[PDB]
């Protein structure tokens, strides 16, 4: 039932000195090329798809026609996303099996389940190895990419940052054997780094944290101030409002490392018991006062702040910050409009003397990072009307709400969307199976709210704008899955591709039209079902007719066989928005071509 192979570098085995009595110990070779190749070259870049067409023979393959599949499988190792499969099928099928000599001494037709496992051998042993020895795969935390940083480089890097840390007090050698929490790791930032806490899987305690911070929110709400909810809070203030709004959004400094352990002691220890127990409390606080990690062998007590990656120190900031919240902004205009996440304040006054004074006032209580303020007040350089905040883009002059795309340079779209589920694995002879669980509506929800489909403050063009959105992202999932269906289901007809896309079109159009009604407002003029499809139909072209060499067929059915033109109840829309790609999908990737 095993119908998958991750990408992933964790799959990989150690490789024996020989090879054992079952395989052909032709790959013995190439084998001992591997410590011979180890044996420190070694320059920059020397890639890998060159590597290692040196290391295992050409007369492993026998002819370059094969070589030429089994290197596809390579080359999608090292561009690969977080959780990504494969079939092994693709490992065996359709390989000439006549040109392999060593396979011709050996059963003419018992062969695909030997060359498939000697090619596992070949990744598991070699080809993942001299990558992991080579490289360091990073997760760059947005979406599902993997950066490939050289290994070199990376670990100067780590004792760069790791000096810091030492040099400072936030780490300090323990010595030793307490049983760490976890490994400490160095992620990169922008020109910053990360540090965060890889957890041990001791679980036992996963459901035990789950407990705690369960009760750690019942603690927030029923004692601290219920901080608003954020359609209603904006909803509200634009209604209350009538000139013009000014707003500030500041980002904290390292908020975890920025809370005072003694203080939330205190805090944690002010709970009723019915609430939370002395037990739990008790375990809570040395928890909280003994963060042991590990990095390189030796054991260290972390106590800058909270670590983060621990399961419980989401909750106990957010504990912590309500607190600060008590004490520092409790006095706040009640006509101003007041909102924060984690670490993200968000003011907004029709004075802007107000405004300023909360900079002011924020800009004392934590130490904020003044590159990621972004504020309309006369007092800046450099103003911004519209702000980022909670996914959502607020314009403080129009007062409308969009969603915001976390999209930059040249980033292959394909990270966005996990399309391998090696719980739930789907067999190479059921696209449609894969092509409708791709299609599934959760991934896209976020993007469906009532922030966006209201006509309470958002003007009806903007709710269009909104949907069309959506809708492109769809489309991009829809293009991500079908590379993979040609590249690895290897589709007969593509019969079901109409059906699919037809139902993901019609369904989704009737989830938006529903949500319309639903938060409808007085900006609310006339929007139809069949305005909607139009929409979502021109959504597809758009992404569609970034492949015109391969969807020809398709985007040719959609315009023949659908309605398109673009008519709405309302005047001040621009049609020409909505037949065209929006700008910040542009530059997006959409070939893979192995980088590093
Ligand atoms: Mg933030």
Redesign the pocket.
């Known amino acids: 039932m095993v119908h998958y192979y991750r990408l992933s570098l964790k799959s990989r085995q150690k490789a024996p000195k020989i090879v054992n009595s079952k395989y052909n110990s032709i790959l013995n070779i190439a084998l001992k090329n591997f410590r011979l190749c180890k044996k420190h070259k070694t320059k920059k870049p020397v890639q890998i798809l060159a590597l290692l067409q040196e290391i295992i023979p050409k007369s492993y393959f026998g002819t370059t026609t094969n070589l030429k599949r089994f290197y596809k499988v390579v080359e999608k190792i090292l561009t690969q996303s977080s959780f990504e499969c494969i079939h092994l099928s693709v490992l065996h099928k359709c390989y000439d099996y006549d040109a392999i000599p060593w396979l011709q001494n050996v059963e003419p037709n018992l062969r695909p389940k030997l060359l498939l496992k000697h090619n596992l051998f070949l990744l598991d042993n070699i080809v993942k190895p001299i990558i992991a020895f080579y490289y360091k795969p990073i997760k760059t935390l947005n979406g599902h990419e993997i950066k490939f940083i050289r290994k070199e480089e990376y670990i100067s890097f780590e004792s760069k940052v790791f000096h810091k840390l030492k040099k400072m007090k936030y780490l300090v050698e323990v010595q030793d054997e307490v049983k760490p929490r976890g490994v400490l790791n160095i992620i990169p930032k922008q020109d910053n780094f990360r540090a965060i806490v890889s957890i041990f899987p001791d679980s036992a305690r996963k459901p035990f944290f789950k407990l705690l911070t369960s009760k750690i929110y019942k603690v927030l709400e029923e004692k601290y101030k219920t901080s608003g909810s954020l359609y209603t809070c904006w909803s509200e203030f634009t209604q209350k409002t009538q000139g013009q709004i000014y707003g500030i959004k500041v ?2 400094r390292d908020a975890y490392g920025n809370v005072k352990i003694p203080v939330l002691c205190k805090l944690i220890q002010s709970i009723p018991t019915h609430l939370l127990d002395s037990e739990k409390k008790n375990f809570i606080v040395d928890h909280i006062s003994n963060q042991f990690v590990a990095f390189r062998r030796k054991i260290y007590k972390w106590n800058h702040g909270l670590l983060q990656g621990d399961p419980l120190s989401g909750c106990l900031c957010e504990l912590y910050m309500a607190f600060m919240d008590r004490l520092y902004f409790s006095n706040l205009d009640k006509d101003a409009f007041i909102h924060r ?4 304040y968000f003011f907004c006054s029709p004075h802007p003397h107000k405004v300023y004074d909360f900079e002011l006032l924020i800009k004392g209580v934590y130490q904020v990072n003044p590159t ?1 303020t972004r504020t309309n007040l006369p007092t800046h350089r450099h103003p911004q009307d519209e702000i980022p905040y909670c996914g959502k883009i607020f314009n403080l002059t129009t007062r409308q709400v969009r969603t915001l795309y976390k999209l930059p340079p040249n980033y292959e779209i394909r990270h966005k969307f996990k399309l391998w589920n090696f719980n739930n694995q789907i067999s190479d002879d059921n696209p449609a199976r894969f092509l409708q669980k791709a299609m599934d509506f959760p991934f896209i929800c976020n993007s469906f709210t009532k922030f966006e489909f209201n006509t309470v403050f958002n003007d009806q063009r903007t709710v269009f704008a909104n949907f069309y959105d959506a809708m492109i992202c769809v489309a991009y999932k829809f293009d991500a899955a079908m590379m993979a269906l040609r590249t690895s289901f290897l589709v007969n007809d593509f019969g079901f591709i109409w059906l699919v896309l037809s139902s993901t079109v019609r369904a989704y159009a009737s989830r938006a039209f529903k949500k319309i009604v639903t938060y409808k407002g007085g900006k609310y003029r006339k929007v139809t079902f069949q305005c909607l499809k139009s929409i979502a139909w021109r959504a597809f072209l758009a992404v569609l007719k970034r492949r015109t060499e391969i969807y020809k067929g398709l985007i040719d059915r959609i315009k023949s066989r659908e309605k398109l033109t673009m008519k709405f109840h309302d005047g001040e829309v621009d049609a020409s928005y909505f037949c065209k790609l929006p700008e910040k999908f542009r530059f997006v990737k959409i070939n893979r071509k192995a980088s590093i």
């Open positions: 980002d904290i996440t984690v670490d993200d990621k």
